[PDB]
Write a protein that binds this DNA or RNA. Structure first.
Ligand SMILES: [Mg+2]
Ligand SMILES: [Mg+2]
Length: 754
DNA sequence: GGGGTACGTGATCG
DNA sequence: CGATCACG
């Protein structure tokens, strides 16, 4: 026993075998388990029914499926004893084949734990936790550069560079002559791909770091390897990287290794308008990175001139991907360990799903039958359940306070749990203020009980940190207490998460109602100190001392948190999040701020996406800069009025009017024909190979009808013959981009034109 | 060699 | 309107 890095299962003679991938004293070891059996639970109307239920049959892969063994078990459901039947199956793929046949049965009240993947079922049931121990993993960052031309089919252009980096340095493999110390010149695209395969197998990294390798680098490598008739044996069992369908996007796994894609991780952890590698690197390390755009890479490759610049960019991409991976992996590894699921899965999950995985493991440990995920009907009804207005204008010297560390303590002290809510024949209860929900005090609730243990464990870690003289364990314990804080602070939100198993609307409302008493205290104490509260949400607040010096606002705020935390009982804690030079607030989670270092931080306002024209994105950036960098809302209004007049008078270049939208299906599969699909159908008719992945660039022209009938492919646009729709670019592009921002200053859509 | 098929928001279609 | 579709 060393350190579990992953778990999966393989089929042998039609039977499942669990594979546990381990790292033991620097050596890769694979353990096999043939004895663990898949199962579900069935709640029956009467014990007699089991004789009919155990005889239920299904079909899978032409062969019939049966219930292997049945076992009567006593468990806890909704904080009540319950008798259910454990229905054993031969193979985990038998469960989706037979579960609906069992649920359909007249004697079956309900079925449970029927959507838990087999490898996760194993980890939970066997009490196995990944990423435990001091085991030191090896890492390798990998990146690729491709030859791309406007609106090409995914994979048409060859891979022209492959870069990798580790502690030994950053290297580039290319198949054109470049005279640089870190460049390896091979003969072909085929030999460059074979070289990457060789590097990976020889370095044998435990972790492969990419920046959006799930959707770009690995699908592209696989497509080009296919075209070239070569295999990619990157798995430690010599298997090829496996593309998995996660939502509408992809996820790539490399067996026996951890494919650590930084893109989903950084997107969750930090707030940015764009997640370009350059923006991300500057945000984390405060250092600038140069970008070489796709068109520049194409020009250099095709001409053979300026290739040294392209190779430096490729090398830096790998080098910074390595630095970022080493920065963000320790926290992902501690979250994995805390929820008891592999890094690959954990790094690609929301906190709501991390809470559910923690709860599922703790439910097994406590013999608690887990509730089911809602059906489409129940999921929609939860979204429909309904259950303070910001200060207008531009504010200077804004202080940010965080409330989130208040709620776990409220859940624990008031025993807020779906299993304690409105229980019959309960002797003592807590009543939520205003909402009136009653929570039984007769037993500790499942969630309050888990939260208490989490918070106690964090206090123990913090105590070990103060009393430790070792900087190495202090670093590790710091990630551990941080991982707990992240998990504990996600419970409040989870009660209201419509896809949650332990979803509880009355729990969320009650926590909000009890929480409000502390928010009202903070608000009152701030206001008596001369502070003006500009924005308040359940998460925190923004305040300033109108007309005060910035150092004075800071000093008073820091002194205020120190004071309030000394008045608030237990682990109830207020946090000073930060300070901002300027800011404005539109509504709930719609605001924009600027720090003292000139970095603009926004929430729910920016439109930095390819399906918005450059004119709209450029105008919005200019409006935000006029307001936050120049403190000038009159400048911002003049910007909009000038841009809209320029659109009216056909003074805007057509290149700034292009909309880009991806084709995601065969064209016949579309139900609603949007502008990009109408344009795509016309291209296909012209002989163009239209395939999913293709990005359609179009311009909306002047005329009668919906925009779809008036959209033209950019390659077909002729400035002499065609006239763009100025009304569409004004009303549907530019004004929507700025109208929300300017509403915070008293302007309506009508006020932003001449 | 498997395996749960994000999520939240806004636009344009029908 | 609800339904469909795409962004990151
Ligand atoms: Mg897996
Ligand atoms: Mg790159």
């Amino acid at each position: 026993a060393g350190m579990i890095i992953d778990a999966d299962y393989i089929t042998e003679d039609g039977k499942p075998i669990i594979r546990i991938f381990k790292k033991e004293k620097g050596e890769f070891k694979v353990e096999y388990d043939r004895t663990f059996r898949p199962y579900i639970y069935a709640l029956l109307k009467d014990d007699s029914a089991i004789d009919e239920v155990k005889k239920i049959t299904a079909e899978r892969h032409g062969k019939i499926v049966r219930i292997t063994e049945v076992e009567k078990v006593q468990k806890k459901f909704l904080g009540r004893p319950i008798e259910v039947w454990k229905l054993y199956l031969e193979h985990p793929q038998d469960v989706p084949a037979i579960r609906e046949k069992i649920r359909e049965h007249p004697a079956v009240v309900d079925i449970f734990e029927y959507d838990i993947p087999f490898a996760k079922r194993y980890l939970i049931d066997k009490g196995l936790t990944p990423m435990e121990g001091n085991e030191e993993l090896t890492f390798l960052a990998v990146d690729i550069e491709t030859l791309y031309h406007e609106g090409e089919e995914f994979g048409k252009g060859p891979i022209i560079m492959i870069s990798y980096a580790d502690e030994e340095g950053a290297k580039v493999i290319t198949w054109k002559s470049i005279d640089l110390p870190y460049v390896e010149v091979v003969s072909s695209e085929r030999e460059m791909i074979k070289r990457l395969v060789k590097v990976i197998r020889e370095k044998d990294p435990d972790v492969i770091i990419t920046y959006n390798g799930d959707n770009f680098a690995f699908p592209y490598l696989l497509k080009r390897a296919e075209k070239l008739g070569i295999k990619l044996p990157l798995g430690r069992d010599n298997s090829e990287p496996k593309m998995q369908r996660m939502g509408d996007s992809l996820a790539v796994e490399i067996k026996g290794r951890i494919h650590f894609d930084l893109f989903p991780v950084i997107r969750r952890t930090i707030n940015l308008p764009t997640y370009t590698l350059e923006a991300v690197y500057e945000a984390i390390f405060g250092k600038s990175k140069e970008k070489v755009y796709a068109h520049e890479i194409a020009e250099a490759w095709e001409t053979g001139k300026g290739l040294e610049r392209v190779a430096k960019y490729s090398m830096e991409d790998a080098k910074v991907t390595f630095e970022l991976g080493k920065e963000f992996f320790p926290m992902e590894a501690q979250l994995a360990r805390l929820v008891g699921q592999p890094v690959w899965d954990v790094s690609r999950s929301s906190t709501g799903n991390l809470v559910e995985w923690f709860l599922l493991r703790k439910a097994y440990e406590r013999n608690e039958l887990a509730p089911n995920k809602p059906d489409e009907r129940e999921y929609e009804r939860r979204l429909r359940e309904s259950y303070k207005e910001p200060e207008k204008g531009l504010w200077e010297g804004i202080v940010s306070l965080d409330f989130r560390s208040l709620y776990p303590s409220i859940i624990i002290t008031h025993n807020v749990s779906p299993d304690t809510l409105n229980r019959e024949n309960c002797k003592e209860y807590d009543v939520a203020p205003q909402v009136g929900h009653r929570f039984c005090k007769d037993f500790p609730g499942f969630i309050p009980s888990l939260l208490g243990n989490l918070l106690e464990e964090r206090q123990k870690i913090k105590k070990r940190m103060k009393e430790s003289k070792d900087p190495v364990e202090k670093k590790l314990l710091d990630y551990r207490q941080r991982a707990i804080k992240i998990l504990a602070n996600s419970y409040y939100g989870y009660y209201g998460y419509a896809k949650a198993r332990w979803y509880c609307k009355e729990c969320a409302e009650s926590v909000t109602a009890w929480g409000r008493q502390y928010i009202d205290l903070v608000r009152r104490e701030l206001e008596s100190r001369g502070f003006k509260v500009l924005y308040i949400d359940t998460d925190g607040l923004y305040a300033t001392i109108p007309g005060a010096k910035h150092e004075e606002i800071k000093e008073k705020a820091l002194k205020f948190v120190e004071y309030i935390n000394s008045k608030l009982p237990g682990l109830l804690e207020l946090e000073y999040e930060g300070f901002y030079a300027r800011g404005f607030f539109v509504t709930k989670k719609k605001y924009a701020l600027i720090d003292e270092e000139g970095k603009i931080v926004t929430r729910g306002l920016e439109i930095v996406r390819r399906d918005w024209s450059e004119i709209a994105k450029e105008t919005q950036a200019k409006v935000l800069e006029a307001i936050l960098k120049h403190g000038n809302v009159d400048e911002a209004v003049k910007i909009v009025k000038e841009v809209t007049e320029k659109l009216s008078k056909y003074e805007i270049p057509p290149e700034k009017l292009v909309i880009y939208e991806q084709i995601t299906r065969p064209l016949s599969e579309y139900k609603a024909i949007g502008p990009h699909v109408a344009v795509a159908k016309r291209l296909a008719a012209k002989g163009v190979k239209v395939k999913p992945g293709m990005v359609i660039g179009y311009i909306v022209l002047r005329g009668d009808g919906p925009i779809s009938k008036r959209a033209i492919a950019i390659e077909e646009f002729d400035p002499k013959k065609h006239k763009y729709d100025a009304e569409y670019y004004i009303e549907n592009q530019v004004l929507p981009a700025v109208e929300r921002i300017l509403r915070a200053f008293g302007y309506r859509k009508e006020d932003l034109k001449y």
